Design a binder for this molecule. Sequence first.
Ligand code: ZQB
Ligand code: ZQB
Lengths: 304, 306
Amino acid sequence: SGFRKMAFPSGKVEGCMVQVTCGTTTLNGLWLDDVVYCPRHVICTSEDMLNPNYEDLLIRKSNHNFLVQAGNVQLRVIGHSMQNCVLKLKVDTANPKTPKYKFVRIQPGQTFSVLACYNGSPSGVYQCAMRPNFTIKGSFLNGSCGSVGFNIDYDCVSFCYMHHMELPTGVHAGTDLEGNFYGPFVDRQTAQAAGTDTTITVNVLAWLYAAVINGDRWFLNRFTTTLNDFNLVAMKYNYEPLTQDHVDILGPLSAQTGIAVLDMCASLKELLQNGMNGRTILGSALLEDEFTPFDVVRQCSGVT
Amino acid sequence: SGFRKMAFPSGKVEGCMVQVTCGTTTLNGLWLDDVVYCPRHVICTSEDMLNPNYEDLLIRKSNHNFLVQAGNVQLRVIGHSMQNCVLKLKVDTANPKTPKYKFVRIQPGQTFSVLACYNGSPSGVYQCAMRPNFTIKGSFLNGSCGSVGFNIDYDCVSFCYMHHMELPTGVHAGTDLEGNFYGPFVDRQTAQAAGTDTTITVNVLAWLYAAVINGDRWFLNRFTTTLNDFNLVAMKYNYEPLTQDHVDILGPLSAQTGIAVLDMCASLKELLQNGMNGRTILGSALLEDEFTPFDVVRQCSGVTFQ
Ligand SMILES: *C(=N)[C@H](C[C@@H]1CCCNC1=O)NC(=O)[C@H](CC1CC1)NC(=O)c1cc2cccc(Cl)c2[nH]1
Ligand SMILES: *C(=N)[C@H](C[C@@H]1CCCNC1=O)NC(=O)[C@H](CC1CC1)NC(=O)c1cc2cccc(Cl)c2[nH]1
C-alpha cells in the first residue's frame, strides 16, 4: 500500500543529456541518433532575448558557434536548423545510448517525469502534470533549459516536454520535442501570464479512488448525482468539466473499489461545498489533481 | 524557482536490479560484483512466514533452489549465506554495470531515493525520509521487497535501504544492505508497531527556508524566541527537540535568506499554535519534514551527478 508521486526510472534518458554552449549561454540538449535538440534561445545574447528575430540570429551563427559536450567528449556540430522553438544540431556521432523513443504532444491533465539537468548532468527526477493552462509546477533554475519530460511505455521513451521558461507566477512553460510551445507562450524575455489555473477534475477523482484503495473512506457518502449536476457545481470552483469519456477512463478504478464514478462525483461535490475541515486524504490537506487514472492504476496494481 | 520532492537519477541503480525466485516466492535482488542481496524471507512459504526459523529454512535450500534472472540473463547461483535479514547469493558473473558504491546505515531524519521494483524491473523512483521511528512513507505492493533506497554522491551510490515489510499504520520498514532492520522490526508475518511518529523539526525549518527562497514569506513574523521556549511548544506537538547542532546545520539557509534560525523557529512556533489558516507553503497545507537542509541547498543551487 501507500501512494507517492513516482517518476519513471531516468536511466534511458540520462544517456541522452548533453551540454550545449553558444557564446556565454550554456544549457542542456537531448542527443538522439546524430541530432541534438535544445531550446533555440541558446543562440541569444541578453540584448537579443527581448525581441529576438530567431530567423536572423540563426543566420549569423555557424556550426562552430555550438559547443556540444557529452560528458567529457566534445561532439562535432556539422549542421544546425530551427524547427519552431527548438534547434536541431546535426552531430557527426550517433548517440550509442539512443533508446527506442517517440515524440508526443501530451494533452492537458496528463503527467510526465522531468529529468532536471544543469550543464548536461541530471540533478533529479520528479513527476509533473501538464495543467489545463499549459503550465507545469516544476523545479527549474538557471541553465535548466533543455531538461526534458518523458513517459516510458514497454521499452519506449515518449518525450513530451522540453523546458524553456519560468512565468511570473513561479510556474513553468516549454515545448514538445518539435518546438511547439504548450499554451500561448513565446521564447522571449517578457512577463507572460498563463490562464486561470483550472483543476483537472478527472485527476482529483482518480486520487480519491487511490485514497479508497489505501483505506481513506471518510469522504464516501451514500449520495449520488448526474454528470450535469456535478459539472454545474465544479465549474463554480474552476474545476474542468467531467465528460463521459473521463467516466470511462475511471472505469477500472471504479470497478476495483466498487464505487461508480457518479457516487465518487457526489463525494467530491460534498468536499468542494463543505471543504475538508482539516482532515487529510492520502496525507494531503488539499485535493490533488496531478495523478492521472493511469498513475493511480500503475501504483495500485503494480505495473513496472 | 520551484521546490519539488526530487529523487536521484536512477540510472546507476537500475542496472543492479534482478529477480530472485525460490519455490513460488519471487522478489527483487541487488546485484553488485558477483553477489546478489535480497530479503531472506524469499525462502519462506505462507505456512512458514508467521514464526519462521530462518536458520532451519535456509538449511533445506541449495544453490539450485535460487533462480536469479537479470532481465533475460540467467545468473548461476554458486553460493548462499545469510547475514542478518539478507541473503548474499554468490553468482558466477560480476554485474558489468556495478557502479561505485558504499553501504551506509542512514540516520533518522536523513532522506534517500527509493527505486520501486517488481520482478527485478524498476517501476519508479521517489524520495523518502528515514523517520525518527525508523519507518518510511513509501508506495510498495506485493513483490516490491528487495527494492533499494540510495543516495548519489559524485558518481558513488550509497545504498542505505532494502524494503522488507508494511506495518499496520500503512508505513514501511526495511534493512540496511547488511540486513539489519532500521528500528525494532522483525521479518515475520506479524502486525508490528512503530513508535510515536515524531516530526523532524530541523527538516520543517529547512523546508520553511526553501519556501522563503521561493517567495512564500507570509508566515515570517516580527517575533523571535530561544531554543528552550521553542522546544517547550515543539514537544507538545511531537516535534523532535531542536538541538544547537540543528541550529548550526541551518546556518547557511539562515544566511542565504537573512532570517535568523531563531526568527524561523518563532515562525514555526506560531504555525504549530495557530495552524496555517488554510493557506499553503510551497503548495502544502501541512508542514513538510522530509527535506534535509542539504536537500534544500542542493535543489536551490542546482547540484548535478557525474
Ligand atoms: C532556461 N535555462 C531558463 C529557465 C528559467 C530561468 C529562470 C528560473 N527558472 C527557469 O525556468 N529560461 C530562461 O531563462 C527564459 C529564456 C527566455 C524564453 C526566452 N527566460 C525566462 O524564463 C524569463 C524571462 C522573463 C521575464 C519576465 C518574467 C519572467 Cl518570470 C521571465 N522568465
Ligand atoms: C515484500 N515483498 C512484501 C511487501 C509488502 C506486502 C504487503 C503490501 N506492502 C508491502 O510493503 N512484504 C511482505 O510480504 C512482508 C513479509 C514478511 C516480513 C517478512 N510481510 C508484511 O509486510 C506483513 C505481514 C503483516 C502482518 C500483519 C500486519 C501487517 Cl501490516 C503485515 N505486513
